[PDB]
Amino acid sequence: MDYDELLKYYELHETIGTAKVKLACHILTGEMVAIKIMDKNTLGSDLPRIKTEIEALKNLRHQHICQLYHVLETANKIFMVLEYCPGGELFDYIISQDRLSEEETRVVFRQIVSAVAYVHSQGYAHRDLKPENLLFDEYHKLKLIDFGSLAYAAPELIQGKSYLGSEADVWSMGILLYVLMCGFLPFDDDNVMALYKKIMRGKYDVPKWLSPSSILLLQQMLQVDPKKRISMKNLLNHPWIMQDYNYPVEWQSKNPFIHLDDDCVTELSVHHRNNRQTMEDLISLWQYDHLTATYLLLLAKKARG
Ligand SMILES: Fc1ccccc1-n1cc(-c2ccncc2OCC2CCNCC2)cn1
Numbered sequence: 353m354d355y356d357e358l359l360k361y362y363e364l365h366e367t368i369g370t371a372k373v374k375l376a377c378h379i380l381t382g383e384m385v386a387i388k389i390m391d392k393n394t395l396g397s398d399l400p401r402i403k404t405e406i407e408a409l410k411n412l413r414h415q416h417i418c419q420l421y422h423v424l425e426t427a428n429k430i431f432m433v434l435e436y437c438p439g440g441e442l443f444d445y446i447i448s449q450d451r452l453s454e455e456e457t458r459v460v461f462r463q464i465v466s467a468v469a470y471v472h473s474q475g476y477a478h479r480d481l482k483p484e485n486l487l488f489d490e491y492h493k494l495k496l497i498d499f500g501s502l503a504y505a506a507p508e509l510i511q512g513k514s515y516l517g518s519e520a521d522v523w524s525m526g527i528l529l530y531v532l533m534c535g536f537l538p539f540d541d542d543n544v545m546a547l548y549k550k551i552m553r554g555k556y557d558v559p560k561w562l563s564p565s566s567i568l569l570l571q572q573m574l575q576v577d578p579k580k581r582i583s584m585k586n587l588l589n590h591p592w593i594m595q596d597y598n599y600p601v602e603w604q605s606k607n608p609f610i611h612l613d614d615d616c617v618t619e620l621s622v623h624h625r626n627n628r629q630t631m632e633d634l635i636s637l638w639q640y641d642h643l644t645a646t647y648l649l650l651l652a653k654k655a656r657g
Contacts, residue, residue, distance in 0.1 A: 354429045361422075361642050362387065362433070376433075380623065383649040385421060388432040405500045406432065408476050410640060414605040416467035418487060418495040422645035433645055435652070437495050439488020446483055451535030454563055455596065461529060462593060462601050463494040468521055469584050469603035471496075477517020480504070481524035483531065490656075502544065503527065503537050507552045507576050519578040522587070526573025533566060534559055538574070552576065565592045609638065616650040 355364075362385065365375040372389040395402055409420040409432075422433035439445070442460065446452070452460065464486065471478055478485075478496070482504045487495045506523035508515045530538045538556035541547040554576040558567055569592040572582040587593065589600035612632055621631045623646070635647050 354426055357426065358387070358424055358431050361645065375436075378433075378645065378649050380646055381649045381653055383653055384436040384438075385649070386434045386436055388434060390430040390432070392428055392430060401500070402430065406430070408499055410638070411474055412471065412476070412499075413607045413609055414467060414470045415607055416463050416494055416496055417470070418497045419607070419648060420640065421648050422642065423640040434497075435489065435495060437487035437489045437497075439490070439492055441484055442486040442488065442494065443483035445488065446531060446535060449535075452532050454533060454566055457529070457532040458593070458595065458597075460494060460532060462597070464496070464525060464528060465584075465587055465593065465601045466603045467494070467496040468525065469588060469601065470605055471499075472518050472521070472584055473603065478521055478524075479509075479517055481521055481528060483528065502547060502551075503539060505551065506578065507554070508578055510548060510551060515578065518584060519581050522573055522581045522584065523575075523578070525587075526570055526581075529566075529573060530556070530570055533562060565595065568592070612636070612647075613651055613654065615654060616647055619650050620647055 358364075361379055362376040363379060364387070365377065367374050368386070374387045374389060376385050376387045377383070378385055390402060392399060406420075406423055410423075413419070418437060419435035420432060421435070422431070424431040424433075464481075468478060468481070476499070478499055480498060480501055481496075482501060485496060485498045487497055489495055502510070504524045504527045506515065506520040509520050509523075527538060539547060539550040541550060554574060556574070558570075562570075569590060572590075573587075575581045582590070587601075588603060593601060612635060617628065617632055617635065620635070620643075621628055624631060626634070634643055638644055
């Protein structure tokens with residue numbers, strides 16, 4: 353029952369994560385995708401919250417956000433077809449490299465900043481930023497996933513205090529910045545209570561390989577008082593961020609909802625019995641059905657060249 357409708361559009365390959373994640377092939381275009389499979393019965397009470405997260409993803413379209421292509425709902429399952437990221441997790445990348453240089457950290461950090469600033473510009477907050485939530489695509493560009501961990505959580509978030517998601521994101525970004533340049537967490541312990549004490553105290557070791565500017569940026573992000581944390585606006589053109597670039601982080605989306613690609617509308621129209629204008633009208637509704645999937649995948653096929 354569960355897989356019948358999905359199997360009309362996708363050829364399923366192997367599981368890569370357990371929500372379960374499967375690699376698949378889009379039949380029409382031949383494009384690889386990742387399929388997030390969610391058991392509705394397993395979620396039960398947390399199900400309406402997963403539905404609000406899907407709706408938020410429908411409103412996020414960005415070069416550094418893993419793209420939603422298709423949402424399929426059955427009696428027992430929710431399927432989310434997503435952008436294929438074969439480079440894997442930034443978590444695995446950090447471990448394989450041990451730690452990144454200041455220069456390579458900047459390449460990756462400016463991409464995280466671009467995604468997160470855009471998420472905030474859309475009225476959302478991520479709240480679970482960590483290197484397991486950042487994937488590399490075939491072009492080695494980062495893609496943010498799993499919208500909506502203890503080692504990355506802001507002191508106020510752990511204490512159960514009221515918080516602004518934007519300030520909790522800036523703290524988690526400070527933790528990511530440290531891990532990128534150090535290869536280990538600033539706050540860590542085998543005991544959960546001792547880790548909780550360490551986060552709230554906000555004291556961490558400053559390794560010898562960190563430059564004075566890196567150290568100052570970490571201080572500006574890793575403030576226990578959320579009001580003392582740097583705002584996203586000042587992070588876009590921060591002196592550490594501008595070093596070797598001399599231009600602020602481009603956070604604005606390059607992936608439109610409005611403008612449609614004429615080649616992709618043309619390619620798409622041959623598979624349907626409608627005229628071009630009807631086709632453009634249908635695509636513009638952005639229903640996250642097979643039509644949305646096909647259009648976005650043709651665009652991804654085109655960008656490859
Ligand atoms: F990760 C990959 C490796 C090789 C080929 C493709 C991928 N890929 C994963 C996704 C993906 C997209 C949206 N949400 C979750 C996703 O994966 C979660 C798993 C959890 C276990 N670790 C690996 C990533 C997209 N492409």
